[PDB]
Design a protein around this ligand. Structure first.
Ligand SMILES: [Zn+2]
Lengths: 383, 767, 267
């Protein structure tokens, strides 16, 4: 919550690239920041790129929302209205550009109808932005963008929106997600600029490596300007939201394990996790259980919340084994990890026998073989 | 009054809206009828309608019928039709009135009713009906007619098109909505039925299908399927099927005939239904019949007042139908010389498909009458068809076909190199297609006899086509036709159009123009409801002024007007050209006489000669100023803007006398060039006797002293009637002349004849 | 052609139904105009119509006006009414036309138009005197010498209709009473359907209330009085069918103050 506080203050101190980013839930935080934004700057309902039909331009989506709020302030209380439809029509008319699979020759006369010379959609959109800022009497606008984890290919489109339409002095941006995915996106695009024949001709180590070098160089020079360092917000993780072993505790969280949990019976967070692990692992209060639960709180927020929200759910259900409840939570939480590990997938075939082979394999990909039977959570692989 | 009971959007609405068990509604009729008549025949004096409806219901009660189409049709048939010599025929005095009605309704139901309640001596349905006159019949037999103007609904009568729609309902939908976006038909639809919309369009169509199905079931008298009981609200018939109790029941049933949508099928069906209802009728089914008939009527009215449906006419069925109708019911063809007008298609393949369809239909028509070695008994290519046809000879037993492609002129678009450039692109495309078929098969020239440029005139002036006509002539197109004088901003404008067509188009002796209504209408009856001033294009205004001066130069008694027109034309030229120097009207004429030249000749194989027709002009040293002005007029954006601009003209800008002098000068040119006019019957005319056709044909009290004979021919195209015919309008002309003009029938027969022989004399058919 | 833009049931329907900030109506207006002219003047050959409308719009744009009754009155007045000698007059040639118009439209708006944007000399205080007239010295002398003689005055009581408009506005409830007592009469039903198919006494009264509200509002603005707040909430024309307006929980009356005691006096 302090994260969003400092974010709001900073971007407020951003108006006197123009892109802020949030690494990571990401969507919850972004919605929080938006509502916090409700020094006059206007926000847009966040665009979820992965929730948009497969063929629009991000810019047309933007312009649709823009039409909405602009008309809304316009339906409220005109000589500005007709001027606005002027730019709207000009843009729409010059909207085919990004679209067409070719260039149509008859468009030349349109290209000769009348301050840079041409049908720059960037300047058209910036004129739109100017008109909107005038109309809504705001210093600028923010454009807000959702994680592309469910579809990481679309965000590329958002970035092109950025560079062809978002190089404005009246727009700030706020994106979220993993820059990792943006990285392979942009690098992959880059290779898409290579000529194939060249690729399948000049294909051994020397130039393959130099090509990788040049492409990664461009990737870096590219994303770097795309996301200025000052404008990323780290966002504090859950475990760093909380004392690692009690020598910390910046804003303890506290959670409610029962339905009643009248704001005082909420069983901390760390202590509830420790209980779950210890008596769900028959594990005592040593540090290994402690270190377990720390490496249990290091997991993605949704993962941990789900596995800690089901275990106590079924525990209360049965209260009207802890090690079987917690195992059911782990199974439904990590089935993909266990399933991809080649580990037993069927549930009715559990017995004991499955266990021996299961852990024997586990140590086989965890290497170890010295204390693999410890089943200790210290693999460089998060699964 | 009767017509309102069968043609009324409000009546349709009320009937469809009210449930099928309502009963005791005759007020809805009397009220709705007063409405519908108020809209349509507004002029009735507020009491005549009351009295007429009262007398109608009086007759109904006296004769012990229920208000309904049974009684209405019985009244109409007894009043109009009789049984006479051969099949029922219609009274000569009442013929014009019958046509006024056919402008609103369809004959077929009335026909069936007359057969039912007054069959002749113990017939095959045939449309249209006719009166009788022995002398006229003898004339027609000895000479037959000659169809020269048939291009209204393709070339067919609409009543068949309605059946065609029911055959291909989806298709008529498609055509409707594709065009529903076009503004023009939106206004037409609102004017006809305000709340029409394609949605209720579909609803009414499918409902009518339902009704015909159900009423056919009862006409066969079949054990009255249960679901009628569930059928309670006409809108229930707006769906392809109906739900009785959990089950969904369709309406299709077995009909004796194969052509389920045949006019003859409908004839037999309605005959049986009426026979079964000779004494009474179930009110629900009877309401079904009103609604059916009404829907027919309004759809038909829409159609007449008006692409894929036409494309559906591209089988050798419609044309064969056309030919069988053209031929009478007798062994010899009722008509002699037919003109086959067809819309050109931009695709060579569509073009040849249409041509083969037409040709095969004609060959089959002829075969259905003559026996002879056909070489290819089952031809499949136009080549084989012509191989069959060339063995045919002009005995006259059958019809002789002459084929002509339409040229449709569209309004110029916002941006182009020169006016109508794109339209000219399209037209040259069609023409290239045509000439290349001519090359490939030279034999068609004995069949494609002339090319006609039709459609609303203002969208393009004729000169756009002179190079087209010239190149086509060199291709081998004998004859040329171009619609003129029909519609216009000002009567002077129409006259100017006609004369410029004369002096510009490559028209040879005997060519035929078309409507030319401008030279038909008097100024007296040309202003009867118009505003006192008329807005019209600046360019056309300038052309009219130039033309007026040109014509009235030589007339001493209008020299004032001539000098005026010169002066205003000069002023208008300065403004439109925004001229800086001085321009003489002489120079203006030098400019405007050039309008027959192709834009892209030299100022912008067969097309060569005209490409260079600008060469001699440019060679002409003294024409410098005219050439530059012409170039500006074509290209200058400002000039084209002012050309589009509009301006008011005094209603009475020129005295009726000046107008008549202009018209008579035009007729002088026309007779000089021996060019004929296809005059069909058709807005301002309260009665047909006001028809300008008469003015030419020389009626004392109607012809004007300076009039000259203009070689007029007959045309079976009346925009606002159903199942019109060349014979029908021959009857029209004869009866009107005989009765309203008291001429002896021999005289009237002669008078209509001379027009008929004009048609033959100037026939486009190969010799 | 102007006349239709001031007399069109379809136009009224569209304007009343549609919202107040929609803007850009020209296409709808054009359509309504053609439907109307079709309804009244059937015989117009359907293309003169486009010619005339186009010429009108050309006028509006060239004179830099917006489609609207103001520009309509502009054109009408400039076309008809001129100032000569004493007060404004109608030109002799266009007199007949003027009656063709007045058969369908009221003069008073036109008269105000002429006075405002083309007043005569600022020396004759013009007092509204209806109807307007042309001028002929001969006729005027004859009238002065012999005066006129009225024998047949039995149409609308003995007054002209434009007065009855203000009378109903004064007495709208009673005007509604007279309408309804007779609305059951079929003849009245027929006439009402003929002119406005969907009139009914309900929309009768609704239009009455709307007109009263519009008059009060526009009198406020003509006095230039601070555009009272509830206009902001005022968003659909139908809302004026009520004697008042609900802005935020509070109901506001449309009445304002008038310089003249008779708020219904043609003056
Ligand atoms: Zn024609």
């Amino acid at each position: 919550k302090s994260l969003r506080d400092q974010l709001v203050e900073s971007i407020r101190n951003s108006i006197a690239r123009n892109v802020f980013f949030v690494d990571g839930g990401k969507t919850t935080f972004i919605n929080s920041v938006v509502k916090s934004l409700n020094v006059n700057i206007k926000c847009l309902p966040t665009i979820d790129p992965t929730k948009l039909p497969r063929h629009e331009p991000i810019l047309v989506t933007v312009t649709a929302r823009l039409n909405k709020m602009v008309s809304d302030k316009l339906k409220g209380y005109r000589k500005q209205k007709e001027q606005w439809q002027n730019h709207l029509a000009q843009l729409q008319r010059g909207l085919h550009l990004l679209t067409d699979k070719e260039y149509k020759p008859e468009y030349f006369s349109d290209a000769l109808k009348l301050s840079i010379g041409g049908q720059d959609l960037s300047e058209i959109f910036e004129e739109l932005v100017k008109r909107a800022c005038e109309i809504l009497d705001c210093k600028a606008i923010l454009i807000t963008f959702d994680d592309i984890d469910t579809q990481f290919d679309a965000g590329w489109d958002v970035l092109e929106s950025i560079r062809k339409f978002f190089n404005s002095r009246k727009l700030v941006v706020v994106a979220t997600g993993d820059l990792r995915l943006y990285s392979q996106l942009i690098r992959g695009k880059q290779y898409e600029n290579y000529s194939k024949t060249l690729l399948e001709q000049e294909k051994e180590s020397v130039r393959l490596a130099e090509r990788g070098y040049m492409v990664e160089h461009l990737e870096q020079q590219y994303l770097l300007k795309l996301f200025p360092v000052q404008k990323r917000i780290q966002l504090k993780t859950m475990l760093q939201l909380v004392g690692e072993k009690g020598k910390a505790g910046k804003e303890e969280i506290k959670v409610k394990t029962e339905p009643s949990m009248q704001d005082i019976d909420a069983i901390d967070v760390r202590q509830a996790i420790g209980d779950a692990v210890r008596e769900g692992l028959n594990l005592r209060e040593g540090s290994d259980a402690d270190m377990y639960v720390n490496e249990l709180l290091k997991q993605p927020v949704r993962l941990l919340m789900q596995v800690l929200q089901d275990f106590y759910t079924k525990k209360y259900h049965a209260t009207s084994s802890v090690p079987n409840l917690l195992r059911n939570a782990l199974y439904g939480s990590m089935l993909s990890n266990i399933y991809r590990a080649g580990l037993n997938y069927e549930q009715h075939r559990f017995g004991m026998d499955s266990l021996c082979k299961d852990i024997f394999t586990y140590v086989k990909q965890d290497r170890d073989f010295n204390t693999g039977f410890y089943l200790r959570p210290q693999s460089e692989s998060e699964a | 009054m009767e017509r309102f009971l069968l043609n009324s959007t409000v009546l349709l609405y009320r009937l469809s809206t009210v449930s099928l068990d309502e009963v005791s509604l005759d007020e809805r009729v009397e009220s709705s009828v007063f409405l519908a008549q108020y809209e349509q025949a507004r002029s009735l004096p507020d009491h005549v309608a009351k009295s007429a409806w009262s007398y109608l219901v009086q007759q109904i009660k006296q004769r012990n019928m229920k208000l309904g189409p049974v009684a209405i049709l019985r009244l109409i048939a007894e009043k109009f039709i009789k049984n006479e010599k051969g099949g029922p025929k219609i009274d000569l005095p009442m013929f014009s009135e019958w046509q006024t009605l056919m402008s609103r309704v369809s004959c077929l139901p009335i026909i069936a009713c007359h057969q039912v309640f007054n069959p002749g001596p113990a017939y095959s349905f045939r449309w249209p009906l006719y009166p009788y006159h022995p002398t006229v019949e003898d004339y027609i037999t000895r000479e037959c007619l000659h169809e020269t103007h048939q291009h209204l609904n393709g070339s067919t009568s609409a009543e068949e098109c309605w059946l065609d729609a029911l055959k291909h309902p989806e298709a008529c939908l498609r055509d409707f909505e594709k065009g529903w976006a076009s503004q023009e038909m939106k206004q037409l639809c609102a004017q006809i039925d305000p709340s029409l919309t394609p949605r209720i369009f579909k609803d009414r169509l499918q409902i009518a299908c339902n009704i015909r199905e159900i009423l056919c079931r009862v006409a066969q008298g079949v054990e009255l399927p249960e679901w009628i009981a569930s059928m309670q609200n006409p809108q229930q018939l707006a769906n392809s099927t109906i739900l009785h109790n959990g089950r969904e029941y369709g309406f299709a049933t077995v009909w004796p005939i194969d052509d389920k949508y045949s006019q003859e099928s409908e004839f037999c069906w309605l005959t049986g239904l009426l026979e079964k209802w000779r004494f009474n009728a179930p009110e629900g089914l009877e309401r079904l019949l009103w609604i059916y008939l009404l829907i027919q009527n309004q759809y038909l009215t829409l159609l007449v007042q008006r692409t894929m449906t036409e494309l559906r006419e591209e089988t050798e069925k419609s044309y064969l139908s056309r030919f069988k109708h053209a031929h009478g019911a007798g062994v010899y063809s009722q008509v002699r010389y037919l003109e086959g007008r067809f819309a050109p298609k931009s695709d060579p393949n569509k073009m040849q498909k249409l041509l083969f369809s037409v040709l095969r239909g004609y060959w089959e028509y002829l075969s259905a009458h003559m026996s002879m070695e056909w070489v290819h008994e089952k031809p499949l290519t136009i080549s084989q068809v012509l191989d069959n046809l060339e063995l045919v000879e002009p005995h006259g037993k059958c019809v002789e076909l002459a084929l002509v492609p339409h040229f449709i002129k569209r309004k110029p678009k916002n941006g182009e190199a020169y006016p109508h450039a794109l339209l000219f692109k399209d037209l040259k495309n069609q023409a290239a297609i045509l000439m290349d078929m001519l090359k490939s098969e030279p034999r068609l020239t004995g069949w494609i006899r002339g090319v006609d440029a039709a459609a609303n005139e203002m969208h393009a002036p004729p000169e756009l086509f002179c190079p087209l006509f010239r190149v086509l002539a060199k291709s081998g197109i004998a004859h040329f036709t171009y619609h003129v004088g029909e519609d216009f901003p000002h009567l002077i404008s129409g006259i100017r159009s006609i004369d410029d067509a004369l002096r510009f188009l490559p028209l040879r002796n005997g060519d035929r123009l078309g409507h030319c209504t401008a030279i038909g209408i008097t100024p007296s009856i040309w202003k009867r409801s118009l505003p006192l001033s008329l807005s019209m294009t600046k360019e056309t205004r300038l052309l009219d002024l130039v033309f007026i001066w040109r014509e009235l130069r030589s007339h001493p008694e209008l020299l004032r007007y001539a000098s005026d027109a010169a002066i205003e034309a000069v002023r208008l030229a300065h403004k439109v050209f925004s001229l800086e120097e001085e321009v003489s009207i002489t120079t203006l004429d030098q400019v405007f006489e050039m309008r027959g030249l192709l834009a892209e000749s030299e100022g912008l194989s067969l097309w060569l000669e005209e490409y260079e027709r600008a060469r001699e002009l440019v060679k002409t040293t003294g024409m410098k100023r005219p050439l530059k002005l012409y170039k500006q007029w074509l290209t200058s954006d400002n000039v084209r803007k002012q050309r589009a601009e509009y301006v008011e003209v005094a209603l009475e800008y020129l005295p009726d006398e000046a107008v008549v002098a202009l018209q008579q000068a035009v007729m002088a040119k026309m007779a000089d060039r021996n060019i004929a006019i296809e005059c069909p019957p058709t807005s301002q005319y309260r009665n047909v006797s006001e028809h300008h056709i008469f003015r030419w044909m020389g009626l004392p009290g109607e012809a004007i002293e300076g009039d000259v004979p203009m070689s007029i021919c007959l045309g079976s195209d009346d925009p606002g009637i159903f199942a019109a015919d060349l014979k029908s309008e021959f009857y029209h002309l004869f009866v009107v002349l005989t009765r309203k003009f008291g001429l002896s029938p021999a005289d009237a027969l002669r008078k209509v004849a001379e027009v008929n022989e004009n048609g033959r004399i100037y026939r486009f058919h190969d010799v | 052609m102007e006349r239709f833009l001031l007399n069109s049931t379809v136009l009224l329907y569209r304007l009343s139904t549609v919202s107040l900030d929609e803007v850009s109506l020209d296409e709808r207006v054009e359509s309504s105009v053609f439907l109307a002219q079709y309804e009244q003047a059937r015989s117009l050959p359907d293309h003169v119509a486009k010619s005339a409308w186009s010429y009108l719009v050309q006028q509006i744009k060239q004179r830099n006006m917006k489609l609207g009754p103001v520009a309509i009155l502009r054109l009408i007045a400039e076309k008809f009414i001129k100032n000569e000698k004493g007060g404004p007059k109608i030109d002799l040639p266009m007199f007949s036309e003027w009656q063709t118009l007045m058969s369908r439209v009221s003069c008073l708006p036109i008269i105000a138009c002429h006075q405002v944007f083309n007043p005569g000399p600022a020396s004759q205080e013009y007092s509204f005197r209806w109807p307007l007239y042309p001028y002929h010295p001969t006729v005027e002398d004859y009238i002065t010498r012999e005066c006129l003689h009225e024998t047949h005055q039995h149409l609308n009581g003995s007054t002209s209709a434009e007065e009855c408009w203000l009378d109903a506005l004064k007495h709208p409830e009673a005007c509604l009473r007279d309408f309804e007592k007779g609305w059951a009469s079929q003849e009245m039903k027929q006439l009402c359907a003929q002119i406005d198919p969907s009139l009914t006494p309900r929309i009768f009264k609704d239009r009455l209330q709307i007109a009263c509200n519009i008059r009060e509002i526009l009198c406020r603005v003509a006095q230039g009085v601070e555009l009272p707040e509830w206009i902001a909430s005022m968003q659909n024309p139908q809302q004026l069918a009520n004697s008042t307006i609900l802005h935020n929980g509070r109901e506001y009356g449309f009445a304002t103050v008038w310089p003249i005691d008779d708020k219904y006096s043609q003056e």
